[PDB]
């Protein structure tokens, strides 16, 4: 479908342009597992970067 | 001519079919500024999609 579901393992507060903020337990849709450690994700009506080491595929 | 020249502002690694991979500083010929955020570009003998927010008209 739109991508894979991952669960945020930790809280993350966006620090730079187009990063998502999320909390531990948030389900994030990962649209792309881009190289470079930041994945294109979507949460709560925002698309943006998610640090790949913060999420677990569920 | 063949289109406008743009400079890549950031590295982009192609994630899907027919996207261009490029590096910051690449000069890309934009053949068409298609609606939907991805433009028809050309770089290094490949034609493909370029994310429009990654390039600056030069």
């Amino acid at each position: 479908g739109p991508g894979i579901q991952v669960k945020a393992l930790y809280d993350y507060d966006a620090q730079t342009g187009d990063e998502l903020t999320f909390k531990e337990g948030d389900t994030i849709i990962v649209h792309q597992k881009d190289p470079a450690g930041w994945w294109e994700g979507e949460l709560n009506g925002k698309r943006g970067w998610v640090p790949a080491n913060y999420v677990q595929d569920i | 001519g063949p289109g406008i020249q743009v400079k890549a502002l950031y590295d982009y690694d192609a994630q899907t079919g027919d996207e261009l991979t490029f590096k910051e500083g690449d000069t890309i010929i934009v053949h068409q500024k298609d609606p939907a955020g991805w433009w028809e570009g050309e770089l290094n003998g490949k034609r493909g999609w370029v994310p429009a927010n990654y390039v600056q008209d030069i």
Binding site: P2, T16 | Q15
Partner: peptide
């Protein structure tokens, strides 16, 4: 109790392809 984020590319998210 969390890992450090990976180094950033300083770039915007690509527009939706979908």
């Amino acid at each position: 109790a969390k890992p450090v984020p990976p180094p950033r590319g300083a770039k915007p998210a690509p527009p939706p392809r979908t």
